[PDB]
Amino acid sequence: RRKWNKTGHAVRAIGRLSSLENVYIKADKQKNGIKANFKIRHNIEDGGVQLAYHYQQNTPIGDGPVLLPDNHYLSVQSKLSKDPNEKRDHMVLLEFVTAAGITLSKGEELFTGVVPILVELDGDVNGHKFSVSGEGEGDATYGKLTLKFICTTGKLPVPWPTLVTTLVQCFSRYPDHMKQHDFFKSAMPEGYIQERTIFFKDDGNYKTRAEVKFEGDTLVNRIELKGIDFKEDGNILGHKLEYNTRDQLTEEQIAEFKEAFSLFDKDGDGTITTKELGTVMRSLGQNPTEAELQDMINEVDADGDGTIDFPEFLTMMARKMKDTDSEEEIREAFRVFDKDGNGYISAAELRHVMTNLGEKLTDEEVDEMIREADIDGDGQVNYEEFVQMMT
């Protein structure tokens, strides 16, 4: 009955494969560097997302030859926590970062063991000034960082999660077949300039400039930050963003993802191919190209084999649940059922979905599905009811 989940999760899975959530890197030959772009989703404490669109560029500080990558991405897992004995405004951060996106150097040497890190930031957002110091270490063998940041000026005037991207991609793990694409370590020890502009949707933007390089045996990130046009009661200056990661692999949740996974893996081999992804998408009335199938897959394909295997699927859904979708995204999902776009999923509409999905349900079982979802009782599922169902 609560079999909204399987179908909900499959639609949600296609949504993930359809989005662009990683950190995309491209060569910037004119600068002998790289450029990057990506999106960050910040949960709003009471529901919703604050999106932050990043544009990035990096040039080497030295003249030594450096590595210019083919296009690829980094994939980041962050967990933010608090130190229970710390009385200052602070953030504990634990991060894992792995390169992927390409299918199957001398500075790299400096990163084979544990390397100490110092971070220093001065900022100014809407005239509100502040500093942050951070210290910890980096273990590139595993793409790992552990760091503790302190707001050295008192209360931080923006939420800590908005600073995470600004506060050392040289610590990411490149897999063996991609080592030639690691611009970040190749620029070391003398390092690189990293610049960004970061747009918070419906709000202000940050401009950052940082110098990242070895000082002694320590990897140091020194940063200036300027934010303008922030709304005094927006999510940023109003402090309306969640701090807590919310990282809850709830095991009955894993079992829910397995169920969705099986809708796609119809031969039961524990991997999803383009054939299989295509089949599910046509059933739902899309018509992706062979190339789009390869790109969708490549977006979550950690090993580069061209397929989404089961662990890669759990990792992707994990992230899809930790982050909040935008209205546009929840609407697009809704439309997968709302075939005529009137605002209402009718009994007939849900039938057409479930039937085309190969799901063997009766006009009686379909009726039960509506009832489970139909709060207001009109015999249909409207937008809000859909949202409640999907939570």
Nearer to Ca ion, 223 or 316 (CB): 316
Can you tell me whether residue 171 is helix, strand or coil?
Answer: helix
Q: Does 267 bind Ca ion (CB under 5 A)?
A: yes
Shortest distance, position 289 Cβ to Ca ion, whole Å: 20
Q: Does 103 bind Ca ion (CB under 5 A)?
A: no
Residues 126-185 that bind Ca ion (CB under 5 A): none
Q: Does 299 bind Ca ion (CB under 5 A)?
A: no
Q: Does 344 bind Ca ion (CB under 5 A)?
A: yes
How would you write 19-63 as a 3-class SS string? CCCCEEEEEEHHHCEEEEEEEEEEEECCCCEEEEEEEEEEEECCC
Shortest distance, position 339 Cβ to Ca ion, whole Å: 6
* In 191-326, alpha helices (H): 252-264, 274-283, 290-298, 310-322
CB 285 within 8 Å of CB 356: yes
Residues 323-342 that bind Ca ion (CB under 5 A): 338, 340, 342
Shortest distance, position 71 Cβ to Ca ion, whole Å: 18
* In 213-309, alpha helices (H): 252-264, 274-283, 290-298
How many angstroms separate the Cα of 9 from the Cα of each of 84, 117, 231, 257?
37, 40, 36, 7
Q: Which stretch binds Ca ion (CB under 5 A): 29-37, 226-234, 242-250, 344-352?
A: 344-352
Shortest distance, position 357 Cβ to Ca ion, whole Å: 16
Angle formed by the axes of helices 4-17 and 274-283, to 10°? Answer: 120
Contacts 24+ apart (CB under 8 A), 136-139: 136/93, 138/111, 138/114, 138/168, 138/170, 138/171, 138/219, 139/113, 139/114, 139/115, 139/171
338 is in an annotated binding site: yes
CB 282 within 8 Å of CB 292: no
3-state helix vs strand vs coil in the chain, percent to 5: 30, 30, 35
Q: Does 378 bind Ca ion (CB under 5 A)?
A: yes
Binding residue for Ca ion, selected from 21, 95, 256, 265, defined by CB under 5 A: 265
Tokens of 39: 């999106």
β-strands 115-125, 308-309: how paired?
Answer: unpaired
- In order, the DSSP letters of 125-143 are ETTEEEEEEEEEEEETTTT
Q: Which stretch binds Ca ion (CB under 5 A): 100-108, 250-258, 308-316, 353-361?
A: 308-316
Q: Does 372 bind Ca ion (CB under 5 A)?
A: no
Q: Does 247 bind Ca ion (CB under 5 A)?
A: no
Nearest-CA neighbor of 221 among 120, 146, 151?
120
Shortest distance, position 329 Cβ to Ca ion, whole Å: 19
Nearer to Ca ion, 66 or 277 (CB): 277
45 is in an annotated binding site: no
How many angstroms separate the Cα of 47 from the Cα of each of 42, 203, 381?
10, 17, 21
Q: Which stretch binds Ca ion (CB under 5 A): 76-84, 167-175, 250-258, 271-279?
A: 271-279
Q: Does 269 bind Ca ion (CB under 5 A)?
A: yes
Q: Does 229 bind Ca ion (CB under 5 A)?
A: no
Q: Which stretch binds Ca ion (CB under 5 A): 13-21, 119-127, 178-186, 343-351?
A: 343-351
Shortest distance, position 273 Cβ to Ca ion, whole Å: 6
Q: Does 374 bind Ca ion (CB under 5 A)?
A: yes
Q: How many CB atoms lie within 10 A of CB 105?
A: 18
Shortest distance, position 308 Cβ to Ca ion, whole Å: 6
Annotated binding site for Ca(2+): 265, 267, 269, 271, 273, 276, 301, 303, 305, 307, 312, 338, 340, 342, 344, 349, 374, 376, 378, 380, 385
Annotated binding site: 265, 267, 269, 271, 273, 276, 301, 303, 305, 307, 312, 338, 340, 342, 344, 349, 374, 376, 378, 380, 385
Residues that bind Ca ion (CB under 5 A): 265, 267, 269, 271, 301, 303, 305, 307, 309, 338, 340, 342, 344, 374, 376, 378, 380
